[PDB]
Point group: D2
Chain length 208, copies 4
């Protein structure tokens, strides 16, 4: 039973201080057996791209069975409100944050999104999920609850969903050049040879 | 009892076909007597600006008493989900649209936003609200439920919230130059002399003499 | 001799009053005989998409022979600076505008772009260009120099490059619904049956 | 003779892979004696904001005497084409990069911008400029030519223009939390107590005690 990967959205940034916040994460779709899995469902601003991709795939949001989060930042999780039948997976320490302290307005939005998750599995890191096709790593070098996911796929080989420990190619290159996070560098060394790096705010890359 | 206007957000556009939709409306705040009124609460992408402005004003979303919509487009209405204590005002023909036919995904979002409105006043056009400080016009030259609002303010004089019949200054200039919508031009002629045009996707403008 | 169309970039809008102006036009590429033609070269913010498309096509900006402008707005014309070997086509009345009056900063950028056009063909409207494959219409319902182009293509049929008289699909729908520009509506009636509408700030549409 | 700081633009990001690149840096303006100084003139997309700030200041691009670059990335340097009378300052090792190899189109744009700089001062790091009001640091943890600038200002105290070694507040917080660049962290330790951090793609921040 093979796991197939599709990148529904490659993420990016839209940010003007005090005026515009439309960051949007990469959205990863996986099919394995009877599971239809999303990692980082993304932000509202990706709605038209997702509409198009769901239509190509012949599926509805109602068919998504499992949704995993690298972390609890709105630009990665907002679209979670679409998936009423999914089980949601997230690192347990997210429960130690007071999201209502994020600002009157912003906190209310986090709270409404988070409250919509009716079935939640809390992770610790090191789990291997979906018949060992998905390995979970606790990678708290961005947010305390941050996770990265290593995927054993048929069509794309061994794929690392980095999350925001490496938001884009430049951040990855900074690690290679030796002046980035020592923790992230050590983590990448631990993971070892992979076929594809899937960043949250850039197009993916085959490591050199 | 004077009505005071503050423009919390001047709107704009962020659109890349097939990739990015982050249009965001102008957000207008009005204080009159014990009412705290918003016209077009805007889009999620304005959340940091709104945070700042609410903080300057010393208010919370819970203090908003009334929210009016030019029309039912997400970039104007999304933030309506923040105002749990407000009465919502919208043109009655919005009920004749099937929002779930807007796309599986996009329809679901519209439906969830619209369902959050627990107290709704249905407008027809021509209403004079808030002790005659707000005049409602049915201006369906964009969407069937579209409304424009004329405000009698103390601090900004006579202010027309156009909505999307004139999204920005260039669209207004096209009317003035004679090659824009005949219906919108007629409407502006009807309204007559005003002090300020507040567009949904641009900075406001003092009109030509 | 057939004319082939490729849409290199579908345009859009990025605009925050007082803070951000990154509007970018649709960029149309046409090959006909030995001509490599661009209509509305676009804005700086399309640079990565253009790099990718030029690389797919196996061409350089040096190989572009002809560049036509719907009108002289920066989000349509900026990338003209890349095409040093091209002949530029533009409506003659652009010369009657004082671009340095656009603002000290913005005027300077217009002036620098416009000064880079070394070979210019001035159009009036109604011209048929490239062995009658491109018909030029003067459509001054946005800017006095504004042009629209009707293209007789092999791969996409009859294609109207609207320019900013209809920036996107919504503006076209407003005309269909009867409350948009009467002049644009009459223009579209005059053009008649076409296979594709190519807007400057949206994906194209089969009418 | 005091040096006055004005932040003309706070920078940001606009990036959609394969479709849109409109990153734009913070733009810093300094007045000292007869000098009108820009650090990182920014990107084309800031043109309306710059227009408005230049108008407020009562100056033209022709009045800018000095322009310094944190580094040679288009979103920081593009607007350099506006300043015909300026001396440009940049780390010498930029000359070792082949900008034509950045891609046919992108390389062309870099080359045209860089060619417009008629008077250039090549920096090495550790220079003290403008009567010692500006200290230059070689901070190559982003690009080989990358510089940061420490400013002694009258109106904002001691200000660090970080450049892209810390693009925004989150990158700075990562350093404070202990999992960011060791080199950047050691650099901030070396700089010591300052009043303001000016990031290239975010609003500035008063540092942590
Ligand atoms: Ni994050
Ligand atoms: Ni992120
Ligand atoms: Ni609308
Ligand atoms: Ni709108
Ligand atoms: Ni235009
Ligand atoms: Ni345009
Ligand atoms: Ni950089
Ligand atoms: Ni930068």
């Amino acid at each position: 039973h093979h796991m197939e990967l599709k990148i529904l959205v490659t993420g990016g940034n839209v940010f003007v201080p005090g005026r515009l916040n439309a960051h949007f994460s990469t959205v990863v779709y996986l099919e394995h057996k009877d599971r239809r899995i999303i990692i980082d469902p993304g932000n509202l601003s990706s709605m038209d791209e997702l509409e198009e991709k769901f239509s190509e795939l012949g599926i509805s949001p109602d068919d998504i069975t499992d949704v995993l989060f690298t972390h609890v930042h709105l630009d990665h999780i907002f679209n979670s409100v679409l998936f009423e039948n999914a089980t949601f997976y997230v690192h347990e320490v997210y429960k130690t944050k007071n999201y209502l302290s994020f600002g009157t307005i912003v906190g209310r939005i986090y709270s409404k999104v988070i409250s919509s998750w009716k079935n939640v599995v809390l992770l610790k890191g090191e789990e291997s999920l979906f018949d060992e096709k998905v390995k979970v790593f606790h990678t708290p070098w961005h947010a305390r609850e941050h996770l990265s996911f290593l995927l054993d796929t048929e069509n794309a080989g061994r794929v690392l969903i980095t999350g925001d420990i490496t938001p884009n190619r430049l951040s990855y290159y900074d690690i290679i050049k030796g002046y980035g996070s020592v923790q992230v560098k050590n983590f990448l060394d631990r993971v070892g040879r992979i076929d594809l790096l899937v960043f949250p705010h850039d197009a993916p890359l085959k490591p050199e």
